[PDB]
Design a protein around this ligand. Sequence first.
Ligand code: HEM
Ligand SMILES: O=C1N[C@@H](Cc2c[nH]c3ccccc23)C(=O)N2CCC[C@@H]12
Ligand SMILES: O=C1N[C@@H](Cc2c[nH]c3ccccc23)C(=O)N2CCC[C@@H]12
Length: 397
Amino acid sequence: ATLTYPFHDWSQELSPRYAQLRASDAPVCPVVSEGTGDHLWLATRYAAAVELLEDPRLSSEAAIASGAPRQEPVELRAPGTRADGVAMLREAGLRSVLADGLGPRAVRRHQGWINDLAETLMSALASREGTFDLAADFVEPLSSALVSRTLLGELSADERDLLAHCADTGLRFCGVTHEEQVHAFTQMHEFFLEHARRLAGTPGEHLLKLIAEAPVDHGPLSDEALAEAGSLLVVAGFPTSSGFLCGALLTLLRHPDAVQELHAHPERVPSAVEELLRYTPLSTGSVKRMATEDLEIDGVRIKVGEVVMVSLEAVNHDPDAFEDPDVFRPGREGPMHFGFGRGRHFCPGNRLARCVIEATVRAVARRPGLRLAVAPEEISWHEGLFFRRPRAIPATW
Ligand code: HEM
Ligand SMILES: O=C1N[C@@H](Cc2c[nH]c3ccccc23)C(=O)N2CCC[C@@H]12
Ligand SMILES: O=C1N[C@@H](Cc2c[nH]c3ccccc23)C(=O)N2CCC[C@@H]12
């Protein structure tokens, strides 16, 4: 009868449904959730997303709450915990501590090691003969170091592997049983419940130590409170950063001509980062908000309690806002991309993300000739992940 969501486009080829809803006159089109039966609005167009994500009558906190109509098959929350995300740290008056942790002065703390590590990892692959896996031998150490040094603390390899596996298990639309999904969030929470304070006390300036050592006016940040901060940091930072870095690499390796230009012209690198954030698809789902009062958008009513989704992928590929939208064009001068969102809930990790993405682009650009060792079609993808990620990326020089 009507389209069901999500659209099962687990590779970098976006579903032709996004294009189809975008070409519609409507600012929103009705879809039905596969895993809940919930009816939902989907927006695909730059013009519509611009209005929908700046409207304070559309609430992110509501659409996170239990009972909200939703796209995901299970609550993204350990049963019995709060998991309303960053609002909990906001509530405890931690606005200045997230500023110190993710703001410009943290990028100055960490940007030096991040750039040297990216160069080192690419230098090591340059030593190999034949074929190597960029996902395991570049993306995984780089995103792990990002997560551990700027967010979590020193992980052991097995702890890191545990946190990755839980993220990959919980953050899915399909492919695992719902009981495993629920247990992945439980497994993360009990880990942080038992190790958050030790992780916060290890050396470094990582965000979890800043949270733990912060003085809450009239408060001690509880261990239950610390654990939820750690779950949020893994969920927000780890699968997003690894998913995107993998996709960005496939984008770069498929455009050798663009990469040569960045090699000749290093001042162009920061602009190619932004184009990567617009061109490279990440989420198989949508950002979402709940109408807390009736409203109207270009002739469509949105009643109280209805849920509006905006697919960042569809909007970043909107020909109305981006000429030749399927072309990777680092010189492009258009509107701001929707890769970190827009409005009040703009990604607060956006400056750390940009810094790792830029290190990676530079590391590719210093060593030209790096190319896919298999056709893009023979690449194998994890299916059902919220955040697209290839199984491996075979590459050679
Ligand atoms: C160190 C890495 C990262 C950290 C710590 C981080 C953290 C966060 C957090 C805590 C939020 C919640 C904001 C809110 O609900 O108000 C968020 C939102 C968001 N992040 Fe990041 N993130 C990271 C990486 C990324 C990357 C790599 C991307 C894209 C390539 C990304 C895209 C987004 C988007 C689109 C949102 C908007 C969610 C919405 O509007 O509902 N993030 N991020
Ligand atoms: O703070 C939040 N923000 C949004 C978007 C988001 C950002 N990063 C995410 C990772 C997975 C799911 C959603 C998001 C959200 O839906 N939330 C559920 C988990 C974290 C919480
Ligand atoms: O796939 C999701 N994406 C985020 C929003 C988002 C879109 N693009 C993003 C990029 C990074 C972080 C979050 C997002 C979200 O709110 N979700 C609810 C259920 C699934 C999960």
